[PDB]
Design a protein around this ligand. Structure first.
Ligand SMILES: O=c1ccn([C@@H]2O[C@H](COP(=O)(O)O)[C@@H](O)[C@H]2O)c(=O)[nH]1
Ligand SMILES: O=c1ccn([C@@H]2O[C@H](COP(=O)(O)O)[C@@H](O)[C@H]2O)c(=O)[nH]1
Ligand SMILES: O=P(O)(O)OC[C@H]1O[C@H](O)[C@H](O)[C@@H](O)[C@@H]1O
Ligand SMILES: [Ba+2]
Ligand SMILES: [Ba+2]
Lengths: 636, 121, 242
């Protein structure tokens, strides 16, 4: 009856025309790869962000007969079917690459139906709903409006087979309504995290005993029961159920009580270069700017040589425990001992870029970079005087009693005036007796109580000249408009040497993923989304040569995790430039595997295993037979 | 009153107990530099583009000796930068530029400040 | 014929008796210099004006963050001097871009030149293949082209040395070391040695193009060489690099 070849696709989450989390950027970068396949058979669904949609959405007239084609008429009728009920919604395009087509339902024009629906869920599924929760109410309203939409289309359109993709427990309200109402579409659910997973990791041992936790007791313990219910339902109600990574897939089986059919890993819209090795040149250039900053920050305390310094960073949302700053700062203090002991000749500036409450840069920072500028200028002025003088000697020889072709004695080129201003310059740099280059670039609102600053102190890293590991904490996201380190985040990362994200709860994390894509080596964990996915695609001792270091945080004592992380850092430091370059080329090669142009075939295998279970015969008819049912990887 | 278009900027260079420069003043000078610098990156692209047009005319169908549409010289990657520069320069709502370049030690008792403050300059 | 948008400058570096560079190639380069210098002044003037607009915005009734009309940036004396530079660049009516850089001693009986004229490649807007014969060994002090031979080599895209007698030939070999792809003949010693060491169709992916100058007619060779040359001219940047 319905064609599985020419089929429609309907993707639904909260984060559509509005950035509310990590979900936003997944869909955004994916549009290019999906629209290239469906063209106009692809439609996204989300709540209308009254405030910020006016910027994001290319508002279009949906009333036109030109606004669609012939086979895409069922939408035209079903949209007016919602306008024939008083339901306001914004249609058009998203102002992003690939230009996907959007349906953004205004939840204000459906608010009165809440008390009817809120009870309807309590009777249909059994989900309690305290209405102080501004958020669960906004989810139910969406779930129903979407079900009221997709039902009216499956009825109108009878040619195409219809597929509905749902992201997160917030947009998965409509999924049990696709089961009980028994609409003739196929549904996929993707959960990017578990509601329990988050809250359990907020206080505590997660990964060793979530086999033995009462799913019903913990949700009521945190007061997150009414939420957890919509997640639990959504996981089962759907044809295909998926997480984003292996380590998450595992935890959703015990906390959402169902095995996932497969993995839908978080791909990226990889920017590529005509020259493969441009990324290498790019590093070069960006590193020069980090240098520029580092000179400013260690001004008059400059003992090490940059041409033999390794930047290291950690970065992302301020979640001290979850992101594993604690292990990063611990490990760094350790590595510092090692390097001193081992009498190494190398240094390691280690940045930490996590937004904290601050009152902007410090007078120190500024003055620092202000003075290094003045030096630079004066130097430049001096060298043109020299230039004048070299040149003149050059052009005069051998006449006027110049015995040598070039100048031999500096005093020929440097004059008193030149020496004076230079010396004045250097004095400006020089800092008060026994003052040390700071561990922070900003005035903090609560410096005493800051977690990161506590830890750095407790381990006594103060950028004393004898420390091989220095620490800078830039408590604020990067941005080329910066006075002191004027770089965009990505430009920073290119310029670095080793990202170091020893996460403890990270369903995915694009931070090390972006990192690899830019061609920078990263340390990560077997409990990280990306980290687990990566130890899967490569053998572990192989993966080190591809710049992917995985710290075991799952079958090891926290102290041993720490020690293993020190090891990787130590292994890396010891590398030569040849070796560092090679391994950077190596890690770039891996780039393609994290591309949507490849992680996107997984959204294909998930879609066809939804077109396998919904109409089991018409697919067995089209291929010739039925293939294995219980897996995404078993189908293709 | 005379509706003059002239302006007087008036310095007072006199030492007083201070805490060095304000983060303001200092940011100030840095943001104006990021502009200065960017405007130089740009002019340089433009330079290429003028040069190329100027080199090949009359060929490839260039009817004017020099470019005529600003658009031929200024790409949006240019615009986008310069636009960011200009945003970095924008003062908060209603914040006028400061009468002083330093954190004073005894600001509320300073003879000079209290005097500027009194005559509302 | 194929209607290709590519061009090919093609260089000949061989010593021949001469009286140094032509006043045309020297004057030419000098006039292109003067233009760059002038473009620098004019972009500096632009910068001031761009910058001023940028700083003053929104004040004094500026409505856009940026200048929008090129008349704000470019002016009278700017256009005046810039045109003067374009003027002194333009060459006499129907005069065409030479095929020598130097004043030859015996240009009349010169084999290379005589061959070019015979083939009539006189560098005309319609010619997709240009010819520049530099009758002097390349040295980075030479005033029109300041490169040492090897530096130049690095700069070129392909080296065509279709020899008949060449017991070794450092030229294609040097070229290969600087990572420049070459066309060489199986009668050249180098070419011979390379023909052996790799299978022949493979060696094309390694930039080693061996023409058969032995078991083929002196007009089957010339065609094979153009089959190579034209294959190369088809390659993209991505492909040229790899
Ligand atoms: O200075 C920064 C640091 C991080 N990020 C971005 O913010 C996100 C924070 O990381 P996560 O918490 O999502 O892992 C990442 O996607 C990263 O690209 C920035 O834009 N600027
Ligand atoms: O401008 C040039 C051109 C070629 N050579 C060198 O002179 C030799 C002449 O080539 P052949 O006659 O030995 O083939 C080559 O080895 C080449 O390296 C130069 O020094 N300068
Ligand atoms: O920062 P490092 O690992 O020392 O890398 C240093 C290297 O960076 C890039 O690869 C540049 O293209 C090289 O010119 C430079 O030698
Ligand atoms: Ba298709
Ligand atoms: Ba495996």
């Amino acid at each position: 009856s319905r064609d599985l070849q020419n089929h429609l696709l309907f993707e639904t989450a909260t984060e559509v025309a509005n950035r509310v989390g990590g979900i936003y950027s997944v869909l955004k970068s994916k549009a290019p790869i999906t629209v290239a396949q469906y063209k106009d058979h692809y439609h996204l669904i989300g709540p209308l962000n009254k405030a910020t949609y006016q910027n994001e959405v290319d508002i279009l007239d949906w009333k036109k007969p030109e606004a669609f084609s012939d086979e895409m008429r069922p939408v035209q009728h079903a949209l007016q079917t919602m306008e024939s009920r008083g339901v306001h919604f914004v249609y058009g395009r998203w102002l992003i690459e690939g230009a996907p087509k959007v349906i953004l339902f205004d939840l204000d024009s459906v608010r009165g139906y809440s008390n009817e629906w809120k009870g309807d869920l309590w009777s249909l599924v059994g989900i309690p709903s305290p209405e102080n929760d501004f958020e669960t109410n906004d989810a139910i309203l969406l779930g129903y409006t979407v079900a009221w939409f997709l039902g009216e289309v499956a009825h109108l359109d009878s040619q195409h087979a219809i597929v509905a993709h749902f992201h997160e427990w917030l947009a998965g309200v409509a999924l049990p309504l696709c089961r009980k109402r028994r609409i003739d579409v196929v549904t996929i659910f993707t959960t990017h995290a578990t509601l329990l997973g988050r809250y359990l990791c907020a206080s505590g041992d997660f990964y060793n005993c979530l086999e033995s936790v009462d799913v019903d007791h913990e949700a009521g313990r945190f007061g997150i029961y009414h939420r957890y219910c919509i997640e639990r339902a959504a996981a089962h109600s759907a044809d295909v159920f998926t997480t984003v990574s292996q380590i998450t897939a595992f935890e959703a089986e015990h906390l959402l009580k169902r095995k996932p059919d497969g993995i839908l890993p978080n791909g990226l819209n990889v920017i590529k270069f005509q020259a493969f090795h441009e990324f290498q040149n790019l590093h070069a250039l960006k590193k020069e700017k980090i240098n520029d900053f580092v000179r400013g920050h260690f001004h008059g305390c400059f003992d090490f040589d940059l041409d033999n310094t390794l930047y290291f960073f950690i970065a992302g949302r301020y979640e001290y425990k979850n992101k594993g700053a604690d292990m990063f700062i611990e490990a760094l203090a350790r590595l510092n001992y090692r390097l001193k002991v081992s009498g190494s000749k190398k240094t390691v500036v280690a940045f930490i870029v996590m937004p904290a409450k601050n009152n902007s840069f410090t007078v120190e920072a500024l003055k620092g970079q202000a003075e290094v500028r003045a030096l630079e200028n004066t130097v430049h002025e001096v060298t043109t005087s020299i230039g004048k003088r070299i040149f003149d000697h050059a052009i005069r020889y051998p006449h006027n009693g110049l015995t040598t072709e070039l100048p031999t004695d500096l005093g020929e080129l440097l004059k008193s005036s030149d020496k004076v201003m230079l010396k004045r310059r250097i004095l400006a740099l020089r800092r008060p007796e026994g003052q040390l280059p700071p561990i922070v670039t900003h005035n903090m609102v609560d410096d005493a109580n800051d977690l990161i600053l506590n830890k750095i102190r407790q381990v006594q890293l103060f950028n004393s000249p004898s420390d091989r590991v220095k620490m800078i904490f830039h408590p604020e996201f990067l941005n080329a408009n910066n006075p002191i380190l004027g770089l965009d985040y990505d430009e920073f990362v290119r310029g670095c040497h080793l990202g170091v994200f020893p996460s403890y709860y990270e369903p995915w994390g694009y931070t090390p993923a972006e990192c690899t894509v830019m061609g920078v080596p990263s340390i990560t964990t077997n409990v990280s989304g990306f980290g687990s996915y990566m130890e899967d695609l490569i053998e572990t001792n192989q993966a080190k040569d591809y710049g992917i270091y995985i710290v075991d945080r799952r079958f090891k004592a926290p102290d041993e995790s720490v020690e293993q992380l020190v090891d990787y850092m130590e292994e890396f430091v010891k590398k030569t430039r040849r070796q560092r370059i090679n391994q950077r080329n190596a890690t770039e090669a891996l780039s393609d595997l994290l591309d949507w142009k490849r992680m996107g075939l997984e959204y294909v295998k998930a879609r066809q295993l939804a077109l396998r279970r919904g109409y089991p015969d018409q697919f067995r008819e089209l291929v010739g037979e039925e293939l294995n049912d219980s897996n995404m990887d078993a189908l293709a």
